[PDB]
From Swiss-Prot:
Assigned protein family: Belongs to the protein-tyrosine phosphatase family. Non-receptor class dual specificity subfamily.
Active-site residues annotated for this sequence: 89 (phosphocysteine intermediate)
Function recorded in the entry: Dual specificity protein phosphatase. Shows high activity towards MAPK1/ERK2. Also has lower activity towards MAPK14 and MAPK8. In arrested oocytes, plays a role in meiotic resumption. Promotes nuclear envelope breakdown and activation of the CDK1/Cyclin-B complex in oocytes, probably by dephosphorylating and inactivating the conventional protein kinase C (cPKC) isozyme PRKCB. May also inactivate PRKCA and/or PRKCG.
Full-sequence range covered: 243 to 388 of 419
Keywords: Cytoplasm, Hydrolase, Protein phosphatase
Organism: Homo sapiens (Human)
Tyrosine-protein phosphatase domain span: 2-145
Subunit structure: Interacts with MAPK1/ERK2; the interaction enhances DUSP7 phosphatase activity.
Location relative to the cell: Cytoplasm
Binding-site list for substrate: 89-95
Protein's recorded name: Dual specificity protein phosphatase 7
Length: 146
């Protein structure tokens, strides 16, 4: 139905959220972070939207943390001008959740544990793939939060 608001201007969702012009418009979302290699940037052209695509599949072979700096900077670009950004994947449970947790760790200076708890409480169905959680553990070390 509706993407979850994780922080002001920061929304977490699935592919159906990404292709719902009514809901995007309702919540002031004009930035879309498409964390898939294969879903279209549906509304990128000729309109008011700004897209970034992180071409990672929801799969144990994938290195999503290499893209954290690019993803996090794109989210902050939106949020800093009070424009909604939707971080989405196909299901809204793994890739998008991973990027959202990474964002919270860096931007709010949260441990992985505190960031994960925060998101899990707002969206009980989150199911980030085991390799992405391993990569979040590594990213926590690079931030100096462990």
């Amino acid at each position: 139905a509706f993407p979850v608001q994780i922080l002001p201007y920061l929304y977490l969702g699935c592919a159906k959220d990404s292709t719902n012009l009514d809901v995007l418009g309702k919540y002031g979302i004009k930035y879309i972070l498409n964390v898939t290699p294969n879903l279209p940037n549906a509304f990128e052209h000729g309109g008011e939207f700004t897209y970034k695509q992180i071409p990672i599949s929801d799969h144990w072979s994938q290195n999503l943390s290499q893209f954290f700096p690019e993803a996090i900077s794109f989210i902050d670009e939106a949020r800093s001008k009070k424009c909604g950004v939707l971080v989405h994947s196909l299901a809204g449970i793994s890739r998008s959740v991973t990027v959202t947790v990474a964002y919270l760790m860096q931007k709010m200076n949260l441990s992985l544990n505190d960031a994960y708890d925060f998101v899990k409480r707002k969206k009980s169905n989150i199911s980030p793939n085991f390799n992405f959680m391993g990569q979040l553990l590594d990213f926590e070390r690079t931030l100096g939060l462990s």
